Amino acid sequence: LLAPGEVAVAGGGSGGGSFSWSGWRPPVFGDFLIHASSFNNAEATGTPLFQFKQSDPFSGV
Amino acid sequence: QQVNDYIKAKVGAQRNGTLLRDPRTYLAGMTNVNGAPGLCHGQQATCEI
Amino acid sequence: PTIAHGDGRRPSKQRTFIVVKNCHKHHISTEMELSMLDLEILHSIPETP
Known part of the structure; x- marks a missing residue:
């Protein structure tokens, strides 16, 4: 988990291993503070969102 | 119009009008200088008629 | 259980009560930050004092 690069890799970084592992880029996330009444909880985790x-x-919200 | 401005002036309305929702929503830099300078008793309690 | 009375009252027969109770799920989390110099150095072998 404590890797020098951007992706976690086996062994604990003992060896450099794959310089860029299979070309895998980690995702980026985004936090938003929504008025709970504005957003219905039952929306499935797939829906694209628009700000x-x-x-x-x-x-702040 | 000038009936409306005459009422608002003699009634004391439109004061402290800078900030509306509770201040925890706003991140920072909210001065809110206009509403008041300081309180000697505490949270202004809203009476209603 | 019940009590037998000598009145003519209707008898509450043998009665059974069922009650269900459900769980509550709780979650917790925190976040840390680690500078990349530390993660990078942790692995490199030191040479000079």
Whole structure:
């Protein structure tokens, strides 16, 4: 888990192994703070999401 | 219009109008200088008629 | 259980009560940050003091 590169690799990084392992890039995530009534929980984990750019400054939600 | 401006002036409305939702929503930099400078008793309790 | 009365009242027969109880699922998490110099150095062999 404590790898020097960007992907975790076997052995604990003892050997460099694959320089770029099979060309695998880790995903990037995004956190959002939603008004719970604005988003129905029953949506399955597959739905593509769209963010409206609120036009008020320094908001947090 | 000038009936509306006459009422709002003599009634004391439109004050403290800078910040609306509770301040935990806003991240930082919210000055809110306009509403008040300091309180000697505590949270303003809203009475209603 | 019950009690036998000498009145003419209707008898509550042998009664059985069933009650179910369900679990509650709880979750917890935290996050850390590690600089890449530390992860990178941890592996390299030191040479000079």
